[PDB]
Amino acid sequence: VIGGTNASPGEFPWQLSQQRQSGSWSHSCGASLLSSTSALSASHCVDGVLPNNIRVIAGLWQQSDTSGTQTANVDSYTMHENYGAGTASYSNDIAILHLATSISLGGNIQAAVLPANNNNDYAGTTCVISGWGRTDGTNNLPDILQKSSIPVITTAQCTAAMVGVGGANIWDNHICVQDPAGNTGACNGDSGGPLNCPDGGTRVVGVTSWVVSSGLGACLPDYPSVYTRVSAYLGWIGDNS
Structure with a gap:
């Protein structure tokens, strides 16, 4: 921004940090928590990335401080099947990240x-x-x-x-x-x-x-x-x- x-x-509270593992984990994209085991993101963010090299962090405010935070690796994800279909740029750029563990919807963490x-x-x-x-x-x-x-x-x-x-x-x-x-x-x-x-x-x-x-x-x-x-x-x- x-x-x-x-x-x-x-x-x-639904704002997530979606990290990518490239040797070391670092913020890649944003995302939003839909539920305890679900997050909403862009297709271009996970496109070509193995789910094992992806995870999200909930309840984060300062990247340097993961205190009272919750991290869930992503089990898998679903990219829109019509992603890229058509003339409109980055068409149907949407995906669901399926968490490997449940996240407790705390105080600073909401769907x-x-x-x-x-x-x-x-x-x-x-x-x-x-x-x-x-x-x-x-x-x-x-x-x-x-x-x-x-x-x-x-x-x-x-x-x-x-x-x-x-x-x-x-x-x-x-x-x-x-x-x-x-x-x-x-x-x-x-x-x-x-x-x-x-x-x-x-x-x-x-x-x-x-x-x-x-x-x-x-x-x-x-x-x-x-x-x-x-x-x-x-x-x-x-x-x-």
Whole structure:
């Protein structure tokens, strides 16, 4: 999250750190806890990764401190079968991580609340993006969980802003976010994370998929950050959870 601020402990209780083992375990993507043995993430995060080289950490606020935290390795995961199917960029970028052990839903640890239906597109809602992804052009990752208020734009606005970008295909299963100042947005490591929107309590209405990056590997907040529309996968989520 670029341009963000410091999140508070137990502020996004369903927020998870999904680590990848590359010799040593390090944060890879974000995720949200659906239940005691379930987590919601992006397909591109687990794509090509053996489940044994993946695990999640619950109740974390500062990466350097795993105190009163809970870690569960991932037994396996389910990637959307139509992932990548079509023209829309990173189509059906959604997956379920199946934990090898149960996580106790503590005080700072709670399951995510999804939308009730697909009746609302949330355009115009000021939501919050959270995560341990890049905060700038460097490769470092923040220690303390970051968060940022950004509003959801309409899909017509999202498609229109991507018209000048080659390879950017927007559709209705995408939910976009854009800062009018062009200062805050998602970046690498935020992927798989939640888009927290107030909707009769904070609900996870999106999963971080992709952002626009310069030819220098930097994330561009003047372009929308694209999330996977969770209200459009409620049935799939329910069958594979």
